[PDB]
Amino acid sequence: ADTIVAVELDTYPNTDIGDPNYPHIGIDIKSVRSKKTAKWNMQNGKVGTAHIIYNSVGKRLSAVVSYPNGDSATVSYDVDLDNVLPEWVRVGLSASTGLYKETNTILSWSFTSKLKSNSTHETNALHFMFNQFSKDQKDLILQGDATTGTDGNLELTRVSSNGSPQGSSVGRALFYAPVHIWESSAVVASFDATFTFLIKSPDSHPADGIAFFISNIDSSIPSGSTGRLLGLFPDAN
Amino acid sequence: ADTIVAVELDTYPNTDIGDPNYPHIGIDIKSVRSKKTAKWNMQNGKVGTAHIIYNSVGKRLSAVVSYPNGDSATVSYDVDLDNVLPEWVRVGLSASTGLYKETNTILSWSFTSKLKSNSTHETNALHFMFNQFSKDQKDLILQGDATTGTDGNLELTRVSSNGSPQGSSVGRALFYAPVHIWESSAVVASFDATFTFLIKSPDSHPADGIAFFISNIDSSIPSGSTGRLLGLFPDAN
Amino acid sequence: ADTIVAVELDTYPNTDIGDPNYPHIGIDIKSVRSKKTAKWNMQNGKVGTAHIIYNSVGKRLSAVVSYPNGDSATVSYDVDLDNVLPEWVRVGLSASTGLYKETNTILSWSFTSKLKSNSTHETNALHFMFNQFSKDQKDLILQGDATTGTDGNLELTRVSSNGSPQGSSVGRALFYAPVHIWESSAVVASFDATFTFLIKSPDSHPADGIAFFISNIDSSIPSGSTGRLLGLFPDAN
Amino acid sequence: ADTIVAVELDTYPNTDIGDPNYPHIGIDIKSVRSKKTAKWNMQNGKVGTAHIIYNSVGKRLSAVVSYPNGDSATVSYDVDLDNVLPEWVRVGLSASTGLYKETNTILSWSFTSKLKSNSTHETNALHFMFNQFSKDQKDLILQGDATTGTDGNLELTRVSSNGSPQGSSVGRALFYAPVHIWESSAVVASFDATFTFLIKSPDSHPADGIAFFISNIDSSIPSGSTGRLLGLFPDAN
Ligand SMILES: CO[C@@H]1O[C@H](CO)[C@@H](O)[C@H](O)[C@@H]1O
Ligand SMILES: CO[C@@H]1O[C@H](CO)[C@@H](O)[C@H](O)[C@@H]1O
Ligand SMILES: CO[C@@H]1O[C@H](CO)[C@@H](O)[C@H](O)[C@@H]1O
Ligand SMILES: CO[C@@H]1O[C@H](CO)[C@@H](O)[C@H](O)[C@@H]1O
Ligand SMILES: [Ca+2]
Ligand SMILES: [Ca+2]
Ligand SMILES: [Ca+2]
Ligand SMILES: [Ca+2]
Ligand SMILES: [Mn+2]
Ligand SMILES: [Mn+2]
Ligand SMILES: [Mn+2]
Ligand SMILES: [Mn+2]
């Protein structure tokens, strides 16, 4: 299977697979069963912002999700990603719907990675920022139901022409270049990511969420990973 | 044929095909015959730095090459790259040797592209920085004789096991991700590139040069573009 | 007097001092009499974005102002700022009102300066970005009627508590740190700036405009520089 | 008294005042007695690199010091800097010598601060990078014996005309602009700092160390804070 690290914005409490019984943000290390969660007031129809930060020194993977009204949820988990992730990875966004649904609309997405060697000034870095997604976004690998160009937005899951979300959808966007996320010789490996999203559901309850993830370079949507699996895992192990 | 925009650090006067009779910096718009050149005193065995700068507002492509003792060569050329390059590109480094040779050693390579649209705050950006090239450097596409990892460097052309450069070599390094170099709705598209290089010819009779280039995404080294053609062009037209 | 370089967003045609007879963008080199202007459709009440770019290689100072509807005005002027500006400078925004008025509201402001030496990797850089201005913005020197903290915005000129603009107002905001804008030894000196603004007038015609400027470090509003003088010059010489 | 948060590269064990009995890296929260230290093998006459990293989400301040041969020391400490520093600060470098001495030579110094608020896209940022310090370097506040310009470096403490360091020296370099280190409404405040240093003791008996610090804006060198007090603290409490 793929190797996944993710920060999940999980809109739907799947308590059968260990979700807490509320919308929550979570840190997923090789399992959908968040090593750590925090309660999250997902505000239906509002533009939210997620920030993900890690460095190899502190070895603490941190995430915050906030809305303009100031409500914010945070989660941090101590993890040495050198021991989790392959040295080269891709990074992406993933979202799903199930039986319940929501738009999983990405308005913007940036990422910075840094690999600082002992050698003096010898930082390697990758940064990208998408504030506008075009129809044919060639630096983005779109997977599953992921489309771009739709209000300048990335729709990770299916939406109808009227902006109505479809259920049992999964989709992801990976940045095209492999990312060197750690290196033997590196003093500091550090990455941060930000994305802004608009999760809107006409249902009883929104589902299933958005995740920022780091995978093996050849990572693909696991079959069946709609719903609670968030486009990330083949199962709930 | 590929579409190439390049800045050439041309170490070998091929007067035969329109080079000036001295080592020079040149701007190459779809031809190895520079639209503009400037005399360049290549310092054998020294680390030089080339900067390349363009924005879509000023519509001037500028390049400078310097060495630590302060000596520098500059060339700039008015061109609207929107009329030249496709909307998506790859950017890269190329080098060649021919009858004569030199180390085409790249010690560092950074690049920033920005696309600032109309919509308000909607910059797309890419930036990468390589101060250290690794043996297997998955965000570079290595072409021809280009290799990475030998002293943390990118050797664009063949160097024998003892640091001794080889004739009739060509190699290139393209950043893996396509680059949105322009867009109709962008207010500003800008890019700048820096690389540091070590050109050493054991005889001080160097050939043929290094180039920063921008090409069609599927650019490959044209057949028999060693020597004066710098791995960029199929001929000297 | 101060030494001023500015990009003006000039909302009011003062043809007595050489303004073209329309709103225009302009490049001001030590005079309010733009060395170069372009017609500008200032859209009353809309959020506009100005981008200013220069580098020391191309020696072309470029500016674009755009609105979300895609209307954009550009101006570029060849100028070697090494010959204009002191080596250390401050950078800022300025705006004025006269007999006519407008809000001169700055929503955001960023600036990057870069000073790259021959010495290898030896960039100096300053970057700042204000997307939110607070009441007591200590990295900003506010001059004249300039206030911050008002919707998270910088109001360069007087506005009443109901957001109504006042005439015969001038104000500016300078970034606190001196900026090293050029250096003998530098291979590349380059700066860019962006700001977003909301110019709204209830009058017949808006006045007088917003400028991004670079001055001597001790620069202050010239007395009387409300109105067409834009907070920049003591007169129209 | 000033409020100091610092990372110390402490070259001289003052066991007397709680140093461990070896050269060490330390995190100093309002006291020269580090909350956390780590053993540091200072390499006489080599260029070392220190990285300091904090974000307000993870609430862990981490520092690493390395030398080109790969050897490195790391310390991290959970602290919420919002409860420690004022909202606005200056950031700087400090060094001292005492009975014993060393070059406290800074070759480069960069810093990034970000304040990411609630409002959507509303990052405030500051970044500066000094790879070259100039004789009159108007964006640094030089305090005590600190000087700039000698080999393009910042000598934090006195060095005789022949490169020979002096005892009982103190000096500091603060970036000129106040830094918005935190804000109540910010979702994320983060900062990171890097500097490269050359500590040379002709005898290999070095004292006293270099620190990266964050202080009240009006921080000055406390009286008799040469030696073990690193120009940071008025006493060793
Ligand atoms: C209750 O059934 C589920 O619906 C929720 C919301 O979609 C998902 O968590 C899950 O995987 C199924 O598809
Ligand atoms: C003399 O033949 C050439 O050698 C020079 C010097 O390398 C090149 O410019 C060229 O294309 C051929 O390979
Ligand atoms: C017509 O009088 C003027 O009003 C316009 C608009 O304010 C300004 O250009 C000028 O300086 C005076 O104050
Ligand atoms: C022995 O006296 C001290 O010298 C050492 C070594 O420099 C310092 O730590 C200290 O504060 C005094 O100056
Ligand atoms: Ca779930
Ligand atoms: Ca040639
Ligand atoms: Ca005017
Ligand atoms: Ca000590
Ligand atoms: Mn979950
Ligand atoms: Mn040529
Ligand atoms: Mn004018
Ligand atoms: Mn100590």
Author numbering:
A (entry chain A), B (entry chain S), C (entry chain A), D (entry chain S): 1 to 237
What does the paper say about this structure?
We report here the crystal structure of a native and complexed lectin isolated from Canavalia gladiata seeds, describing a new binding pocket in ConA-like lectins, which may be related to pathogen resistance, a site where a non-protein amino acid, such as α-amino butyric acid, can bind. The most recent accepted definition establishes lectins as proteins with at least one non-catalytic domain able to recognize and bind reversibly to specific mono and oligosaccharides. The oligomeric structures of CGL and CGL-αMM involve two 'canonical' dimers, and these dimers are associated by salt bridges between β-strands. In both CGL crystal structures, the amino acids involved in metal binding are conserved.
